[PDB]
Design a protein around this ligand. Structure first.
Ligand SMILES: CC(C)c1ccc(-c2nccnc2N2CCN(S(=O)(=O)c3cccc(-c4cnc(N)nc4)c3)CC2)cc1
Length: 833
């Protein structure tokens, strides 16, 4: 242990926002044992990285260029503009031309130590991929934009260097609970519920004699369980709960990370309920020992299948993931488990029908995971895989076969699911896990993933007492192998970020619920930023939410506090890249108040929906604006250029409490549209945007929004914001939207025909992916929400997706929705006062 070694680990602590060397809140080896464990994988991957692709992080895809998109090409001709000092020149290019082929089609057109960086960004067009298959190139086409690139020497790989390094029954004694203070009522009653638990499947359950709720309550009882030790499954949780009604909980893994039976004396500080979720599963103990409830415990311990059964079975397998299997359903799946293995789709339900509390049966389960041959051959199906990592499955080998499948994902896809897989670590019974390692693999393999992984992790470590230890050990594994380049970038980012959390907090306090932003408050802000620039704040930091963009110095004059309840900052920066084609500013918001994580989740689903729509050549021009959480109820938000609220547009001359008129929206588009044809573009863009956000929100159950939370770009692109948050209407199709389509109050139109038609395809498109959507929603709710319901709240989505139903009744159901919204018109909007 050098110094060196410490100062490093010190900077590491500073990045993570947690100290993984601290052993104050542990009762065993596991975290430390996971740190040592993760080294081998980290290394393996570090020592395997192609150093120059690593350094240049090409952002590519194996996916076919969508149709829409194809019809935006001259004649197998794509234009590119290169630059060298204050020089330029275009090259015609064909979609399949490699970069190398291009670069050489230039040295011919009149050394190899030169490469194609995109202008303004830290992004590269290198490696063996068709230009069509780079994402920037795809982003350029979508947005009607010209592709601009600089020529310069490759960044040095050496910059990215890493630094070296029994048959008896189970019982538990319940000695007693203790708590420094009570006053919440006066004397009620309370017992302890000991639960043996696997995939949230309760295996066995005992309670204690009631007693009255004194600051201390001893028992002091042995509690015997049905189950025998030998039949305890790896991953079993002793789950201890205190009822009056449910008030505190805490879990103890019964089998440890060396497969030993947990044996001895414990004092487990519990977690409290704040009135079915991932926080309830945790092995973590409450780190706040001053105030927490405390519990105390001692551990001393061939042939075929008849027509209609096959059909009963297949009926069951066909079912959705929320369709509950009866004991019949289960006995059937198990008994015919060999038939079952022939369908990858039957797996969740099959392994949900394993009696894990029986060792002989567990044994048999492994026996048939030995015969993996159909699973292995099957085409990856992220929904199906993802199901094998929720709270229902808590066996190492099951979850491993899932992860096995994710290995075949290319980078492109990993990013789409990165946040949910990170969150899936909540359901892991152990700190080291296939899933953990896979994230760590992939993050270390590709810079882009490695960046979003860093913040996704840090996001939780900063504000999940229940999991911050675990995720911290993992964040460390990453940072220990990601390269000094990136430590530097991160360290800077964190520093910028922390600075701005202070400024944002100091300011919020300096403002009460008077809805006005007084100049001596804007005096304070304007100043504070100067007093930081100046200090302290570095020459340039990399934009999380979009790590292609570097930001440098503030544009103070353009910065402002926002005249909303939360008083968020609205910060604009210059772009530290001297090469970009514009002067448009880099705009970031900061915000204390709401839990930003919920927002990240809805956005990432929104991207999963967009990509689905690509697989059927649909483009609904969502804007999932960038949004990274950073700390307790605080994070950051992308500023979407040339955009206003819809509320803001209604407060025209048509002002505050007296509103709203149907046209208005329309003039604003024309007012802001240079030519009647660009205006024309906008109504297209709008018809689409509207389609997207209508189906999306409906499905996600966030349909019904006041329009101060709905926005639109000058160019016609509408978009919800502030998912916050948390007489109805299924969505915000208000008469002002409808005219512009040209139809109010209840007629019809070319565009409202178009609109209707587009939704119908979109809804249906999503329905072709019911299961994936169901698992994500379900996962979204358990890993990121306040009050939920292991049935009802999650079952919302099966309904909104109209599971059951032929293609027809679905389409019908949706146009009703539309008609509901019209009935109706301005009712709800008005109702918000
Ligand atoms: C930016 C201006 C046009 C604005 C001002 C106030 C409001 C607003 N009005 C009523 C109620 N709430 C409001 N919010 C302002 C701040 N936001 S936010 O910071 O959490 C947020 C969330 C999502 C998107 C945005 C955003 C991004 N880019 C731009 N250009 N504008 C807004 C801002 C919450 C909602 C919306 C937009």
């Amino acid at each position: 242990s050098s110094e060196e070694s410490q100062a490093f680990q010190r900077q590491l602590t500073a990045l993570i926002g947690y100290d993984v060397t601290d052993v104050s809140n542990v009762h065993d080896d596991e975290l430390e044992f996971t740190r040592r464990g993760l080294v081998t994988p980290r290394m393996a991957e570090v020592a395997s990285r192609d150093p120059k692709l690593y350094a240049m992080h090409p952002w590519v895809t194996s996916k076919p260029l969508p149709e829409y998109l194809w019809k935006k090409i001259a004649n197998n001709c794509i234009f590119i503009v290169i630059h060298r000092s204050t020089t330029s020149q275009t090259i015609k290019v064909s979609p399949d031309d490699t970069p190398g082929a291009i670069l050489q089609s230039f040295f011919t057109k009149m050394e190899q130590d030169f490469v194609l960086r995109v202008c303004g960004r830290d992004e590269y067009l290198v490696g063996e991929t068709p230009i069509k298959n780079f994402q920037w190139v795809r982003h350029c086409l979508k947005n009607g934009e010209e592709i601009h690139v600089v020529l310069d020497t490759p960044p040095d790989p050496a910059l990215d260097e890493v630094r070296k390094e029994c048959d008896r029954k189970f019982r538990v004694k319940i000695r007693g609970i203790d708590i420094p203070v009570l006053p919440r009522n006066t004397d009620l009653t309370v017992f302890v519920e000991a639960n043996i638990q696997h995939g949230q499947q309760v295996l066995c359950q005992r309670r204690t004699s009631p007693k009255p709720f004194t600051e201390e309550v001893l028992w002091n009882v042995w509690l015997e369980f049905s189950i025998k030790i030998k039949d305890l499954p790896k991953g079993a949780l002793l789950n201890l709960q205190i009822y009056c009604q449910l008030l505190y909980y805490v879990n103890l893994l019964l089998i440890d990370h060396r497969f030993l039976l947990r044996r001895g004396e414990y004092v487990l500080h519990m977690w409290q309920i704040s009135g079915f979720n991932a926080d309830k599963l945790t092995s973590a103990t409450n780190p706040d020992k001053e105030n927490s409830m405390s519990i105390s415990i001692l551990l001393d311990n061939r042939a075929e299948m008849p027509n209609q059964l096959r059909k009963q079975l297949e009926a069951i397998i066909a079912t959705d993931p929320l369709n509950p299997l009866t004991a019949e359903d289960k006995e059937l799946l198990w008994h015919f488990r060999y038939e079952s293995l022939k369908h990858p789709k039957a797996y969740p339900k099959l392994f949900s029908s394993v009696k894990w509390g029986q060792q002989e049966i567990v044994a048999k389960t492994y026996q048939l995971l030995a015969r993996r041959e159909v699973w292995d051959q099957s085409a990856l199906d992220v929904g199906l895989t993802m199901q094998l990592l929720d709270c229902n499955f808590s066996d190492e080998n099951v979850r491993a076969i899932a992860v096995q499948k994710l290995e075949s994902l290319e980078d492109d896809d990993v990013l789409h699911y990165l946040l949910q897989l990170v969150q899936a670590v909540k359901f892991e019974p152990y700190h080291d896990s296939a899933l953990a390692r896979f994230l760590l693999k992939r993050g270390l393999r590709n810079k882009r993933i490695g960046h979003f992984l860093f913040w996704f992790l840090r996001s939780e470590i900063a504000q999940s007492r229940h999991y911050q230890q675990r995720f911290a050990v993992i964040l460390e594994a990453y940072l220990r192998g990601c390269g000094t380049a990136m430590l530097h970038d991160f360290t800077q980012q964190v520093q910028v970020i922390e600075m701005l959390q202070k400024v944002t907090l100091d300011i919020k306090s300096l403002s009460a619920e008077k809805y006005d932003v007084s100049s001596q408050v804007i005096s304070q802000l304007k100043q504070k930023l100067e007093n930081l620039q100046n200090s302290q704040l570095p020459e340039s930091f990399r934009v999380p939410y979009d790590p292609g963009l570097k930001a440098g110095a503030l544009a103070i004059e353009k910065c402002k506090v926002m005249a909303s309840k939360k008083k968020p900052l609205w910060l604009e920066f210059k772009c530290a890249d001297p090469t970009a084609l514009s002067n448009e500013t880099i705009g970031i918001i900061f915000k204390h108040g709401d839990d930003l994580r919920q927002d990240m989740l809805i956005l990432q689903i929104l991207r999963i929906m967009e990509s689905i729509w690509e697989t059927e050549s649909l483009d609904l021009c969502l804007l999932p604006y960038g949004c990274i959480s950073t700390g307790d109820k605080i994070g950051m938000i992308e500023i979407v250029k040339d955009a206003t609220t819809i509320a803001k547009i209604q407060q025209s001359t048509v002002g505050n409490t007296g509103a709203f008129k149907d046209e208005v929206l329309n003039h604003w588009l024309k007012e802001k549209s240079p030519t009647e044809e660009k205006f024309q573009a906008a109504v297209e863009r709008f018809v689409y945007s509207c389609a997207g956000y209508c189906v999306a929100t409906f499905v996600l159950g966030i349909g019904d929004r006041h329009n101060d939370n709905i926005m639109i770009t000058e160019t016609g692109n509408l978009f919800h914001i502030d998912f916050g948050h948390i007489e109805r209407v299924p969505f915000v199709l208000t008469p002002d939207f409808l005219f512009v389509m040209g139809t109010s109050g209840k007629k019809t139109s070319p565009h409202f025909q178009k609109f209707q038609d587009i939704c119908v395809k979109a809804y249906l498109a999503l329905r072709h992916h019911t299961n994936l959507l169901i698992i994500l929603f379900s996962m979204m709710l358990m890993t990121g929400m306040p009050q939920l319901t292991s049935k009802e709240d999650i079952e919302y989505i099966r309904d909104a997706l109209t599971v059951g139903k032929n293609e027809e009744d679905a389409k019908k159901y949706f146009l009703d929705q539309i008609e509901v919204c019209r009935d109706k018109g301005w009712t709800v909007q008005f109702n918000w006062f």
